[PDB]
Structure formats: C-alpha cells, structure tokens
C-alpha cells in the first residue's frame, strides 16, 4: 500500500502492491491482464501472490463561475479516490473528489456538469 | 444514444514515468493537448446526446 517503483527478479513496474484473491500454478512467476499487462507477481522470497494496482491519477478539472462574478473555484480529482490526494471543504462522488466545494443536500437545477448525477453551481 | 466517455493521460501513455521521453515530447508539441481536446468534445457530446 504505497506508490513505488517495484522490481521482482528484474521485472520493473509502477504501482501499489496488495495480497491477492487470485491463485497461480506452482511454477509461474508473473501474471497478466486480458490486455497482457503484468497485473500480478509472485515475490521470489515469500512466494505469496501479489496483485499490482497502477497508482491513481488523472486530469485535475477545475470548476469556476465567471471571472466577472468571483475568484473562487473548486478543484476536481477525476477517477481518484481522495485517500491519496493530500500526498500532493471536500466531498466524494462516483465521478471523482470535489475539493473546495460545499457539498449540499438540496438538489437545485443543473449548471456545471460533473458526473453520475452530480453537477455544481455558485450560491450563498 | 451515446458511446462511453474516454480520456487519456497521453504523456503517461506515450512514455510512462520517463523524463527523457518527456523532453522528446516537448519537441513534438501540441499533440498531447489536441489528443484530449478532441476527447473532451466527444465527452461533452455524450452529455448533449
């Protein structure tokens, strides 16, 4: 559970490591995706099968009113769960994490489309 | 009615983790912007659809 450059038996890759639910044959030392990407490895000391997750990343989106209207903005970390964003008001959605936004309950009419039913607006 | 949204981290996709590659990309130019300004157009057009 840290974003690292790993290497097992010379096999470099980038990600975070976790203990698998998957199970290898006795003699295999690398495992892959349907897209032929090392999705798994078996540590040549402990042999316990490790699944690899590539670190979470993406385009920061930014939500702004008119420059005329304000200098306030909310910063959106798309796809990323917010649990590693402080390594670089806050809320979480299927579409990403809204930082600098007051999460309200009242379902107003839409203006700034975000995803999975979410959209934003500027109000008191 | 619509097709799935996609975006790509064109820099991570063309040379993941490499600064030496990144300085080669910085000779190519606008191709990384362009190759998501196109996909933004698709992404918004799904919402409008």
């Amino acid at each position: 559970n840290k974003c690292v450059n790993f290497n097992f038996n010379g096999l470099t890759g980038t990600g975070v490591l976790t203990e698998s639910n998957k199970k290898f044959l006795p003699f295999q030392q690398f495992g892959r995706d349907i897209d032929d990407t090392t999705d798994a490895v078996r540590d040549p000391q402990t042999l316990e099968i490790l699944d690899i997750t590539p670190c979470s990343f993406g385009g920061v989106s930014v939500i702004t009113p008119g420059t005329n209207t304000s200098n306030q903005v909310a910063v959106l970390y798309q796809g990323v769960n917010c649990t590693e964003v402080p390594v670089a008001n806050v809320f979480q959605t299927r579409a990403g994490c809204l930082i600098g936004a007051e999460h309200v309950n009242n379902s107003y009419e839409c203006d700034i489309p975000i995803g999975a039913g979410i959209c934003a607006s500027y109000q008191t | 009615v619509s097709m799935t949204k996609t975006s790509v981290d064109c820099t991570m996709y063309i040379c993941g983790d490499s600064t030496e590659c990144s300085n080669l990309l910085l000779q190519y130019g606008s191709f990384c912007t362009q190759l998501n300004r196109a996909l933004t157009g698709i992404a918004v057009e799904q919402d409008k659809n």
């Binding site: 990407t37 590539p54 798309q78 796809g79 579409a95 995803g115 | 991570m12």
Partner: peptide, 24 residues
C-alpha cells in the same frame, strides 16, 4: 448487455446515472 489502467487511458462515467435516464 454484458478504475485506472497502467498506461492512463480511462473509462469515465456518464452525466446522468442509469437511474436518472430511467426516471426520464
């Protein structure tokens, strides 16, 4: 009919959920 990837393509979610279109 029948989340990042290592190279940084991303499937990205819809604006309206599959419930909200049903509600339309």
């Amino acid at each position: 009919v029948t989340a990042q990837k290592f190279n940084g393509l991303t499937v990205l979610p819809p604006l309206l959920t599959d419930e909200m279109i049903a509600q339309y």
